[model samples]
Structure formats: structure tokens, C-alpha cells
Target: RIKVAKPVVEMDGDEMTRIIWQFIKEKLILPHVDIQLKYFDLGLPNRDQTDDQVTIDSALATQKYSVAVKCATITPDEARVEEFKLKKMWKSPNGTIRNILGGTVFREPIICKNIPRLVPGWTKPITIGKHAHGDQYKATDFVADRAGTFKMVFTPKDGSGVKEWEVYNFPAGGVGMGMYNTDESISGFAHSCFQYAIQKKWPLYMSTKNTILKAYDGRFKDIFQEIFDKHYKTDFDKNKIWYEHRLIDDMVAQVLKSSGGFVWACKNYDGDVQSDILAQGFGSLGLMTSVLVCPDGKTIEAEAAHGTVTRHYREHQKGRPTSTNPIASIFAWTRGLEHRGKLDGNQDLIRFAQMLEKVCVETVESGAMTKDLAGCIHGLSNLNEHFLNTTDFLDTIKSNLDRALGR
Candidate 1:
């Protein structure tokens, strides 16, 4: 057994993915490794039961333990609230965790040779390090029903200086919004991106509409530049990778043209929209995995980029076979555990985690995949023989891992 000396936080989630989560832990992980798992159920019912303390507790555990592998959970929308009988609307667990962690969320796609891609040129993975903190998500947006003058004021804490801007002199009624970002938060985001790109040994690109929103967007561009020069520049040079800022429009065009092997650091809104584009452009959300890297770069939380698989959960509820993809969830464990191995300097543990990841790809390459990937490859063929159901695909991975490890 690969005995890990350190603890790794395991945050569980809801529905079909949760069902598959246990199968993976039991069938793949527990059998091979002797490790301490700090398990916290971030499932909807448990969140409601614990008043969502469990989610906070897990995030705290992540801070302490420095590595967390999580399952996809529900964010509890209005319809879901009624369905689950939740007490008051709870914020997304992801948002809550990122709030405490102060980091960037990076989404990377899992590649398989046989799985077809829409962007045929995209042989390498293009990772998105999304700045999940305040922007439009936290902006104060108000409607202007009547013509009036609007102003924004900032007063010094010590009454040293007062600055105010007449935002708009409304001739007719319309709408306006105000947004803000801080140096520290942007610094945190920059550090995480650099750390991630450094670790990946890939060039990093950050995008902003600086030409238009000069000061507002330029602040983001400037923060990245200074941090890159003072800290990451030398290391990046040594690694033979570079960091550059591009206008968001140009970056989008460049991304389409290039076969990606770089990381793109995006603001909250851009990442929110573009990551979805990437998920589809590459292949499938089921094959995409995400990791949240704190500023320290040591602490991280890994999870599947997709959600709880509610459609399949309904099938599972009815005792029906479902062909849900489990690759990304499997990756969450590998990534979190790999970080643990790196931290503890455990070579054997690292190899084990990496090997499992290799076989997951190899197994898919061998045409042992789920519905989503099968669809990507076969293109609406309605071929049942091409794909395996959830359990069987995992079982296939289990055997593949065992064989690859020479069990």
C-alpha cells in the first residue's frame, strides 16, 4: 500500500456524481493507498442539516490540510430550493470556499486520443485560470427611471482626502452599474496564475479590454505586469515560458488560431463565459476538471467542472442504468493526491496518482468511455456498444489501473 503520511480533505457532494464518488473511493483509491481522508458531506441535505457549516468546515480543513478533492455539488437554485426544502437560499459552495481561500480557479480539460475535438488544431490543453472574485458578480446595478445626475464618492478612512466622480448626467432614464476591484485581490489572482503556469511549465496569457476601459481594465493589466517582472519573470525565463497581456478580443482570436499549450488568466466575467466555450470546444464538460489554487500555491481544491448529473440521478433513483462520465471526478482525486505526494515528497504516492490518471486517458483512448465521449467520437450514432454505463466504465478503469501498476 502507498501509505500517505498526511491527511487529504475529501468533500462529498450531491446526486449521481455523489453516487459515483463512493464507487471510485472504494474501488480505486482505498484499495491501493493507505491514506487518511477527511470526509465532509457537502451534499444538499447535509448542507441544510448542518446549516452549511459543513461546507465552511471543509474549506477550513482545506486551509489546514492544504489539499482537497471535492465532488460536484448543487448550488441550490430557486426550483432546487423548493425541491430540497432548503432553508433560505444558500450561496454556491464554490463561491463560499473561494471567498475563504482567496485564490484562482483553473479549469483544465482531460484529453483522449480517440475522442474527437471540434477544434482539430487544439492538440494541447488550454487552461483557464478564472479570477472568481468581485466584478460584475458583486457590482451594484441600479435602474434609472427618471432623468437625474449620478455620482460616486470615496472618502478617506482618516478623512485625509475625499474623491468623487460624477458618473453620469442622465438626460433620459436608463440603467447604470458600479464595480470595484482591489490590488490585493488582483495580486492574489496573479500569484495563483503564475504559480499554476510555473507548475505547468506553460506560457501564461492574461486578457483585458484595456483599450476601452483604460483605468478599470488597465489596473488588471498593470497588476499582472508588475508581479510578472518582480517575481515570476526570472523563473519564467528559466523555465523557457513567457507571460504576456493581450486585449480580450485579440486573445479570443489568437486562441482560436493556436493549438493551445498555454494558460489564460481571465477576469471573473470572461472566464465565466469563455470556460464554457472551451469546455465545448475541446470536447465535454464531463471530461473537464478544475482546481482552485490559493495564493501560497500549495493549497488547492480539485473537482469536476460539471455539476451533480441530475438527469442521471433521476435514472439512478428509478433503478435504471445510466451512462454518466466519471473521468473528471477521477481526475479530482488524482490531482489532489498528486499535490499531497509533492508536498510530502512521496515519490511512490506521486507515481500511483499519476499512473491512475494515465490509465484513465488510455482506457478512454482504447474506446472504453461513457455516453458523452462516445457522442463526441461517434456523433449521435446511438451506439450502445460503443460506450459503457457508469459502473462498468469505472470498473474498466479499475482493471486498467491494476494492470498498469502490475497488480
Candidate 2:
């Protein structure tokens, strides 16, 4: 057995992915490696029962342990709240974790040669580092009924005079919103981005709308530049990778035209929107891996970029066939464990994780894949010709991993 010296926090989630998560741990992970797993159930029912302390506890454990692999969880809506009979409409577990972690989220697509991509030119992966703190996501928005002046008021605690800025004079009435971010968060985000890029040995680009929202977006641009110059510039130059700030519009166009291999650092809103586009453009969310890297770059939490497959879960409940992809979920484990291995100086464990990841990619590239990947390759026509059921695909990966590792 390949013994692991350090324990990794394993966060379980909801729906069909949860089922796959169990299978992955049993069939792929446990068979080869003897490791201590710190398990936390982040399932909806468990969250409701524990008042979502489990989620916070998991995040804290991650901070303590430095590495966590999480299953995709549900961020409930009104319907989900009623369905689960939740005590409260809890905020997104991911957002809560990000808030606690104070880091940037870097999402990269797992590339398979056989799978056709929307952007054919992208032979390499494009990494997106999202500044996942305080933008429109945490904004206070209100509907304006009557024509009134909108102003932002900031009062000092030490009896310094209040600073008020007139935001807008609404001639007719429409809507207004207020959003904020701190230099601490921005600096952390910048550090994480630079650290991630340095680790990847790839160029980094920070995209912002500084041309329009000069003060708001300009802060992102300036902070990135300042941080790069002060901390990362020399290292980046030595590594042969560079950092630059680009207008969001220009970056989007450049992304479409250029070959992939660079990391794009985005603000909260742009990351939310562009990451999906990148996922689709690359191939599928099933092949997208999300890694939350702390500012210190010592801690990380990995998970699938996709959500819990509720539709497939319902089909699973009905005893019907479901071919939900598990690559991203599997990748979450590999990434977290790889980091754990690195931290503990466990070369055998690291090799095991890397071998498992290689087996997964090779399994897909060998023409065995789930329905989503098959659809990408076969274009919804003759899907049965190439695709395997979820179980069969995972079994194929397990067999391949065992063979590759001479187990």
C-alpha cells in the first residue's frame, strides 16, 4: 500500500455526483493508497441538519490541513429550499468557503485530444483565476421608484467628517446599486493569481474594465500591476512568463483568436461569466477543474467546475440509466491529493495521484467516455457508438489505473 503521511479533508456533496464520489473513493483511490481521510458531509440535508456548520467546518479543516477535495454541492434556490425544507436559505457553500479562505479561484479545463473543442486552436489549457470577492455578488441593489439623487455615504468611527459622493441624480427613477472591495482582498487575489501562474509556468493576464469604471475597475488593474512589480516581476521574468493588464473587451477578443496557455485573472463578475464560456469553449464542464488557491499558495481546495446533476439524480432515483461524467470530480481528488503529497514529501503518493490522472485522460482519449464527452465528439449522433455508462467509464479508468500502476 502507498501510505499517506498527511490526512486530506474530503467534503462530500449532494445528488448524483455524490454517488460517483463514493464510487471514486472506493474503486479508484482506496484500492491503491492507504490514507487517512477527514470526511465532511456538505450534502443539502446534512447542511440543513447542521445549520451549515459542516461547510464552515470543512473550510476550517482545509485551512488547517492545507488541502481539500470537495464534491459538487447545491447552492439552493427557492425551489430547492422548499424541496429540502431547509431551516434557512443558506448562501452558496463555495462563496462561503472563498470568503473564509480569502483566495482566488483558478479554473482550467482538462484536455483530451479525442474530444472536439469549440475553439479548435486551443491545444493547450487556458487557466482562469477569478477574484472571487466582493463585486456585484455582494452588492446592495435597490429599485428606484421616484426621482431622487443617489449618493454614497461613508462615516468614520473616530468622528472624522463623513465623506459623501453623489452617485447619480436620477431624473426619472430607475435603479441603483452599491458594491465594494478591500485592498486586502485585492492584494490576496493578486498574490494568488501570480502564485498560480508561477506554478503553472505560464503567462498571466489581468482583465478589467478600467477604461469605463476607472476608479472601481482601475483598482484591480493598478493593484495587479503594483503587486506584480513589487513581488512577482523578477520571478516572472526569470520563469519566462509575463503579466499584463488588458481591457476586458480586448481580452475576450484576444482569447478567441489566440492559442491557449496563459492564465487570465478576472474580476468577480467577469470570472463568473467568462469561466462558463471558457468551459464550453474548451469542451465540457465535466473536463473543467476548479482550484481555490490561498494567497500564501500553500493551501488549496479542488472541486468540479460543474454543479450537482439534479436531472441525472432524478433519473437515478427512478432506476433509469444515467451517464453522468465524473472526470472533474475525479480530478478534484487527484489535485488535492497531489498537493497533499507535495506537502508531505510523499513521492509514492504523488506518483499514484499523477498516474490516476493520466489513466483518466488516457481512458477518454482511448475513446471511452461519458455521454457528455461522447456528445462533444459524436455531435449527439450515434452516441452509443463511443460512450460508456457512468459506471462502465469509471470502471474502465479503474482498470486502466491498476494496469498502469502494476497493482
Predicted structure with the largest lDDT when compared to the true one: 1
**How displaced is residue 398 in candidate 1, in Å?**
2.2
TM-score of each: 0.88, 0.91
Q: Which pairs of residues have clashing backbones in candidate 2?
A: none
Stretches off by above 4 angstroms in model 1 are: 136-155, 162-179, 195-201, 232-241
> By TM-score, who's the top model here?
2
Can you write out model 1's per-residue Cα lDDT over 1-407, one digit (the tens) per residue?
89999999999999998988998899999999999999999999999999999999999999999999999999887898899998966778887787688678889788777888888888899999999777875567788999999999899999788998999999999999898878898999998889889999999999999999999899999999999999999999999999999999999999988999999999988986788778878888877878887877689999888889899999999999999989889999999999999999999989988999899989988878888888887775666888899999988998998899895
Residue 345, candidate 1: C-alpha displacement in angstroms: 2.2
RMSD of each: 3.1, 2.6
lDDT by residue for model 2 (1-407), tens: 88887899999999989999999999989988898999999999999999999999999999998999999899987899899988887878887787788678889898888889988888788999998788775678888999999999999999999999998999887999998999999998988889879999999999988889999888888888999999999999999999989999999999988889999998988887788789888988788888888876688999998889899899989998889889999999999989999999999888988888899899988888999888987786667767888898888988888799885
lDDT of 1 at 66: 100
In model 1, how large is the Cα lDDT of residue 8? Answer: 99
